[PDB]
């Protein structure tokens, strides 16, 4: 039995931690909602 609990407001934070790269990838999406890489 699943339940929800509030965790916060949805707002943009000025000067939040900035990380992550920006990969451009060829992908396929199957009928089950699974993404896979196309090579």
């Amino acid at each position: 039995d699943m339940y929800i609990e509030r965790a916060g407001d949805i707002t943009w934070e000025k000067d939040a931690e900035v990380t992550g790269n920006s990969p451009r990838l060829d992908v396929a999406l199957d009928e089950s909602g699974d993404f896979s890489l196309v090579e």
């Binding site: 339940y3 929800i4 943009w12 396929a28 896979s36």
Partner: protein, 156 residues
């Protein structure tokens, strides 16, 4: 139950202790999460019940109490923020420049941020604080890193 707009953890007591299986967004009286988090099951909010209203396994999205309300889209140029809500940890904003998933049916934004599976359904926001999609359906690339699509539904 609590109907206030915001980000929520999705918990279960079926397993050992209380386990966070995902996250979702309450907006305009509708609860939005990824399909793989709830498998379409009903949810509890205090003494109240939230019943599924729309869902789609291929999009990996589900809405409760009403139709999907989130319609903002990534502009294709700007940095965004993942409002990550990790299991047992406080909500935290992470800013990043999305990459792209190129598919035979068009391009989708993608965020290269690696968080526990229980963070699925955390919202990705633009600079106006609008939810442009949910984090948690993606792929594991060559180096073993996780890259999530920015998954957004359609507002009818």
């Amino acid at each position: 139950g609590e109907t206030t707009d915001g980000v929520y953890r999705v918990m279960t007591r079926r397993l050992l202790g209380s386990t966070q299986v995902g996250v979702g967004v309450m907006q305009e009286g509708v609860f939005h999460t990824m399909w793989h988090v709830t498998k379409g099951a009903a949810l509890r909010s205090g003494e109240g019940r939230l019943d599924p209203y729309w869902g789609d396994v291929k999009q990996d999205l589900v809405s409760y109490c009403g139709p999907w309300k989130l319609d903002a889209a990534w502009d294709g140029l700007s940095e965004v923020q993942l409002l990550a809500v990790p299991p047992g940890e406080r909500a935290k904003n992470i800013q990043t420049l999305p990459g792209i998933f190129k598919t035979k049916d068009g391009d989708i934004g993608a965020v290269a941020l690696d968080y526990p599976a229980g963070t699925s359904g955390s919202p990705i926001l633009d600079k106006c604080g609008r939810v442009i999609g949910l984090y948690g359906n993606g792929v594991v690339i060559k180096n073993g890193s996780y890259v999530s699509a920015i998954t957004q539904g359609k507002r009818e």
